[PDB]
Design a protein around this ligand. Structure first.
Ligand code: CL
Ligand code: CL
Ligand code: CL
Ligand code: CL
Ligand code: CL
Ligand code: CL
Ligand code: CL
Ligand code: CL
Ligand code: K
Ligand code: K
Lengths: 31, 32, 33
């Protein structure tokens, strides 16, 4: 349970960073 | 594009909430 | 719409960092690896 938990948390963070930059790129098109 | 990103944020918030529940379960278990 | 999207992304990122910190604490408590 511990390894799968660590792995899913790291994936969540990297997905969240990806999303934050995609939203920043979108903000360049709309405001 | 705007609805794709809104859907994604809700998907990841849901995952975050369930991971938080799993953390709290594991903390109680190792605490005993 | 855009500001509500941004607010959720920043909520998400704060939760993911809190999760990362919590997992590091738990990993030390468990002691594995
Ligand atoms: Cl995921
Ligand atoms: Cl993703
Ligand atoms: Cl997950
Ligand atoms: Cl939560
Ligand atoms: Cl759950
Ligand atoms: Cl809009
Ligand atoms: Cl911010
Ligand atoms: Cl903690
Ligand atoms: K995304
Ligand atoms: K919502």
């Amino acid at each position: 349970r511990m390894k799968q938990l660590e792995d899913k948390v790291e994936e969540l963070l990297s997905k969240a960073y990806h999303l934050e930059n995609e939203v920043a790129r979108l903000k360049k098109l709309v405001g």
